[PDB]
């Protein structure tokens, strides 16, 4: 999966991430950049404009939970399918989220990391993170395949 | 289909690239090659090491094509016709690869132009890059 120098770079950058706040930003951006994903969140209230989405408190709160699970994935990189077994059932068997959306959310998070870290988010650092978000998306889609 | 607001957002954001076209294009390619190694099969004769002159030269060509597309955002199929045959007919590039390069381009713009990468502009850039990809395939 991740080379020693990739695991070390991933953990280093993650120590600088406010997991709470990064989650709201990435989930908000997902809903703004790919508006069909808002359909899965009808109950979250007003998502009618980018400003409404980015100010929505249910988005902010649910983002914290999403990013908490990503953080949990980083501590179990060799058994992501097992760590995400419940979330997979929920997203695949109950919510029927098309798995391409898992890829989109992982890539939006990568965009947020590049946004805030700039030059520090180097091509090799991004590459390690692409392996992580691909593992997470695959573990989330596991009940599909 | 781009909205009027999308076109304004893309013109404003991409216009900040300016003289950095080559650097940003080369960086987006290097990001793609490292993050998605399968994309390297389309450049079998390239030196793909960091800072390679071949990647620099090609990165400039890609960024310069996007500047042209931005200038012709109302008639991109016409402005990108030669590029469409190159990628779709000659090169036979699998469409999934355009999503990878487009993503790596957003990453590069976010890292270099933080003030420009608001959620709404992010969204417009993504739609613009997808529209360019649709044409080239």
């Amino acid at each position: 999966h991740l080379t020693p120098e990739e695991k070390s770079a991933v953990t280093a950058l993650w120590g600088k991430v406010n997991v709470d706040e990064v989650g709201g930003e990435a989930l908000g951006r997902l809903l703004v950049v790919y508006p069909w994903t808002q359909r899965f969140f009808e109950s979250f209230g007003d998502l009618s404009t980018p400003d409404a989405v980015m100010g929505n408190p249910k988005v902010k709160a649910h983002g914290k939970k999403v990013l908490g699970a990503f953080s949990d994935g980083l501590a179990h990189l060799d058994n992501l399918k097992g760590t995400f077994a419940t979330l997979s059932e929920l997203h695949c068997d109950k919510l029927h989220v098309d798995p391409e959306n898992f890829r989109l959310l992982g890539n939006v998070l990568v965009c947020v990391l590049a946004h805030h870290f700039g030059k520090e988010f180097t091509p090799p650092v991004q590459a390690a993170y692409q392996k992580v978000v691909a593992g997470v998306a695959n573990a989330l889609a596991h009940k599909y395949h | 289909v781009l909205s009027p607001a999308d076109k304004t957002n893309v013109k404003a954001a991409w216009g900040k690239v300016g003289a950095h076209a080559g650097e940003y294009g080369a960086e987006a390619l290097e990001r793609m090659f490292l993050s998605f190694p399968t994309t390297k099969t389309y450049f079998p004769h390239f030196d793909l090491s960091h800072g390679s002159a071949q990647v620099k030269g090609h990165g400039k060509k890609v960024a310069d094509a996007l500047t042209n597309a931005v200038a012709h955002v109302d008639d991109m199929p016409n402005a990108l016709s030669a590029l469409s045959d190159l990628h779709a007919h000659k090169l036979r590039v699998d469409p999934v690869n355009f999503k990878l390069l487009s993503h790596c381009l957003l990453v590069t713009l976010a890292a270099h132009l933080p003030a420009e990468f608001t959620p709404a502009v992010h969204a417009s850039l993504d739609k613009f890059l997808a529209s360019v990809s649709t044409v080239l395939t």
Partner: nanobody, 126 residues
Framework: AQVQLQESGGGLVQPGGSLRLSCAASGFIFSTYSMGWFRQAPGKEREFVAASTWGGVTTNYADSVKGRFTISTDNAKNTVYLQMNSLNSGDTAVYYC??????????????????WGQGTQVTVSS
């Protein structure tokens, strides 16, 4: 009209003690400014303490304060907080709040800041 960065909290503490600073920001779109904390001891150069990128999404701590100080933001109150624990005599200084528009994480320690507060005295002593 004017941009204000008001520091509060702080005062006197014993070594080992704790203190919470706050910086209330006004006059700019808070969601777009990276908020930072610097400090300056009498006769000495000003020096980075801790900062976060806009919205508080990412953090950057001087190695001497990491794990020891914690920075936080309250986007609803346009306020940033610096919780200082395990204070030592070397922590006595004037602490400055600072704001920089869209300043990314690595540049927080040096990156030019746009707005500076007045600073508030923090005194650690026995």
């Amino acid at each position: 009209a004017q941009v204000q960065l008001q520091e509060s909290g702080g005062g006197l503490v014993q070594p080992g003690g704790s203190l919470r600073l706050s910086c209330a920001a006004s006059g700019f779109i808070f969601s777009t400014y990276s908020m930072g904390w610097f400090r300056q001891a009498p006769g000495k150069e000003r020096e980075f303490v801790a900062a976060s990128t806009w919205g508080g999404v990412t953090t950057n701590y001087a190695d001497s304060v990491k794990g020891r100080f914690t920075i936080s933001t309250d986007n609803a109150k346009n306020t940033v907080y610096l919780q200082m624990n395990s204070l030592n005599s070397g922590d006595t200084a004037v602490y400055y709040c600072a704001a920089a528009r869209f300043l990314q994480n690595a540049r927080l320690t040096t990156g030019p800041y746009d707005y500076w507060g007045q600073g508030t005295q923090v005194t650690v002593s026995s």
